[PDB]
Amino acid sequence: ALTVKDVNILSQYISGVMARADHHAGNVEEIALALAGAILWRKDDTNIKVMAKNVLWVTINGERYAFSYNHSSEKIEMRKGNIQGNTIHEFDNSTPLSKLVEIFKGL
């Protein structure tokens, strides 16, 4: 799995996400940038890790969160704890930024 250890790798990863979203998942291409900001906003010191569909793990306020793309619903799914459970939020280009801020502010 990829460990996002520095800003160089982080930009490359975000670029990878945006390239993939443009080509094959256009319905999350916009929210992806805001999600990137939100995850960096709220993460603990633990490094972001992307594992293998890929799953991105981040720890926020002492809880582990998994982000991954669902081709069938065309959503980015957010799970709390283990990828083997229900989503707590789903994001796409229709998600209001007001709602995104509200969700991350409260984590």
> Of 26 and 85, which CB lies nearer to a second copy in the complex structure?
26
* Residue whose C-alpha is closest to residue 71's, from 14, 5, 106, 20: 20
What is the residue-wise DSSP string for 44-97?
Answer: -SSPEEEE---EEEEEETTEEEEEEEETTTTEEEEEES-SSS-EEEEE-TTS-H
Tokens of 38: 């939100």
* Smallest separation (angstroms) from a second copy to the CB of 22: 8
**Residue 101 binding a second copy, by CB under 8 A:** yes
**Residue 45 binding a second copy, by CB under 8 A:** yes
> Of 5 and 24, which CB lies nearer to a second copy in the complex structure?
5
**Residue 6 binding a second copy, by CB under 8 A:** yes
The whole-angstrom distance between residue 20's C-alpha and the CA centroid of its chain comes to 14
**Residue 103 binding a second copy, by CB under 8 A:** no
Please give the residue ranges that form the binding site for a second copy (CB under 8 A): 4-8, 10-11, 14-15, 18, 22, 29-38, 40-43, 45, 47-48, 93, 97-98, 100-101, 104-105
